[PDB]
Symmetry: D2
Subunit: 253 residues, 4 copies
């Protein structure tokens, strides 16, 4: 199943879509600057692009840690990103009441991995009618992703993206099961599957891991820069596009 | 560090406390009925008991599974349980705004494992000043509990219980690391540690018994059941009495 | 099923047997010194005791590294231990050809965890007719122990002990699944199950104590270990817990 | 670091080498027919090819399932394969005494993963001076491979290949950590790294896993087929076409 996001066709047999951006919104000017680098690089490379950022870091290690600009500022910054660049955007939501107002602005709304079993958040997200990015919890097997998809379907929203971010591997370490992509395709109605390489690394390896995941034939790549050094983005993406073009050119089977 | 909960002393050197009850509150009649059975068994063996139920469960098996009776009626039911049986109670909260009114009634407030990192909820819970049960995520190592504890401390509350529920072991399976209890005690200032055996298992009674006995062998403040019962508790109490009556290793 | 080893009765509803000694045999006199200590401690505590040692270090730090006394002298040393102390002994074997000569001297022959699938070693060990300790591989599920037991049974030996030594938990780490003990009993015909706490352990004295206590809480035939008076402090506590558990009827 | 195996160059920057064959040597004529198919397909696609089989499978499903033709007959069969097709061969050894006779015939000798820390076998293998394929144990981290390599180096052999076969993931299951390839390259002096996809499993799965691995820039791919977890022999060509496509792309771009 493909999903149209404005003029972008997102699908597991379509050219890969870059979901790219930053950890958290910090100011308008820094956001616009970073986003302009992404747009410029992806435009020239011919890669469909969706800008990513959180408006709030809800689970930092200290109650005093900087959390980003917050929701009201955040949606103001997103509105300007959309106006200036004409691209879709994606952000995460942490509380049910945030969903509809966030969804008025942000094209794709994201269910954080920790909150996949917050059933009222699922319901509130589904009710917006927006495209949804479901972050696969590190504690959830690829065959059980269907359980989350089921909930969204029962709540009336079938515009769902499945986002790999690694699986718990002993303590304080993650492993990406390259077979999980295919399991998710087979068991969740071939919904778009994307790969968050950035959060998968938590514990030069970013390129190798990204290439490996995209070799399994995926709708998109999800990443953050500062995270990849921003100036390496073009060279990084040249590689990814080379591999994606090759895989997508091969008949399935 | 011990925590007084009404007449109960909760601590890793104290007789173990049983936490148990029902999944979600339906009605006063239904609640008092189940609570009465736990109360009768625990009173028969002299085991301290805290009744558990959810008034509004956000982590449900299905979208339309009953969440519980809700805040207003749920707290009335809890008030009744406390009055009738003279026991403390425990309930989970998932909304920051719910922490304060819940804390007027519920002796212990529980932080769901999936929300254990959610700063706004932690702060809202801390600010109640109530005893808090921190459920350890299956994806967090025991040495990361100190960070959650630290956030409660920042927000002004040190009346904290750490609750083991298992750790992710490949796909689907949970394993309980018996060494994790000690790691939590050493890094978190010997706070009360309790063992959620029921959720550690995601026949079944025989499994639960072995696992409960193994955990309680490590010297724990409590045992947590979302869950015959007399036979089980006799065995737990026997082991717990033996263990707690011996001094900790000499240094 | 119980196994008689001289006058020791080994089984899951009998008083636990200690399997203890040293990593690798180095010299007769240090061997006799160490064995003397275990014998003295276990005797005065009333615990049956089997002395353990390897005649060879199969995985060595360097290709030049020590290695141990080797089979020839190793068996000399075991002969003297048995003569001096009148106790049974246990050693591991790594090559099928070693099995019959080692079994002439050593009461229990041990299948190393990493060789548990070496079918020729399995067969060679079974052919000796000796008591066999099967070390559970750290990759193998407890239910799959029945496959190794089956091979020993087809090869004509049912005098088998199953030995827990932890399961792989991410990289460079082990966890002991306390539910595995019961699975092995249920699926392998209640053969004796013992717990290698030493190798399960990927301050640390209290870790080993907690872990041993948790395992022995599941009702086991024995404990396998290596070593101010820490052995007796440890064993006093293990014995007290084992005595309790073995006095309760099986549920 | 590259290794020359007859006229094949094996290395992490070279066109991938296929290490392909069967589980257990059972026979002469069937072995030759299977090998002939591997040869025909690999020659058609221009892919360097090394035939694989065990003559003595020590890890068996039952105590009396056939171990294989054994040392002397196995080596005779390998000699015939080499004579008939002009290709190198690879086999495994489980005992120090087997090392010399096997190394005299076989172009690569393989250290079984479960034996990879057995110092006596490591030394006996090293001292052959033969090219060695070291299977990474499923219970061993990628950063620990340098310790096996060190032991080979101490015994005088540096012609070493490191072979991924997955890591233990919960019970009775494996996952392939795609980051481990790079860890092994960086910590083990960029020795050739190869990927045993067959034993990493437990197929469209085989193809996905193989492509993911080869995307990380590897010296070779290790697999088994069945003449009628092993790939169907008649689908070999389609499979290798897809692998070759990705390998040729990756290898044609400079490392970033
Ligand atoms: Cl994110
Ligand atoms: Cl997660
Ligand atoms: Cl959890
Ligand atoms: Cl092989
Ligand atoms: Cl292995
Ligand atoms: Na050779």
């Amino acid at each position: 199943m493909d999903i149209k996001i404005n003029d972008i066709t997102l699908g597991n047999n379509s050219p890969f879509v870059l979901f790219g951006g930053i950890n958290v919104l910090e100011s308008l000017d820094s956001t616009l600057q970073t986003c302009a680098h992404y747009v410029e690089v992806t435009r020239k490379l011919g890669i469909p692009y969706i800008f990513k950022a959180s408006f709030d870091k809800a689970n930092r290690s200290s109650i005093h840690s900087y959390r980003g600009v917050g929701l009201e500022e955040g949606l103001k910054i997103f509105e300007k990103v959309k106006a200036e660049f004409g691209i879709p955007v994606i952000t995460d939501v942490h509380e049910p009441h945030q969903c509809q107002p966030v969804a008025e602005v942000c094209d794709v709304i994201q269910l954080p991995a920790f909150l996949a079993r917050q059933t009222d958040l699922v319901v509130a997200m589904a009710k917006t009618g927006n495209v949804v990015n479901i972050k696969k919890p590190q504690f959830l097997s690829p065959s059980q992703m269907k359980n989350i998809v089921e909930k969204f379907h029962e709540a009336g929203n079938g515009k769902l993206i499945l986002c790999e971010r690694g699986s718990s591997f002993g303590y304080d370490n993650l492993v990406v099961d390259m077979l999980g992509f295919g399991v998710m395709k087979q068991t969740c109605g071939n919904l778009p599957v994307i790969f968050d390489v950035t959060h998968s690394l938590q514990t030069a390896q970013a390129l190798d891991l990204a290439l490996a995941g995209m070799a399994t034939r995926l709708a998109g790549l999800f990443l953050e820069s500062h995270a990849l050094p921003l100036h390496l983005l073009e060279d990084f993406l040249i590689r990814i596009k080379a591999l994606d073009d090759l895989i997508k050119s091969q008949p399935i089977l």
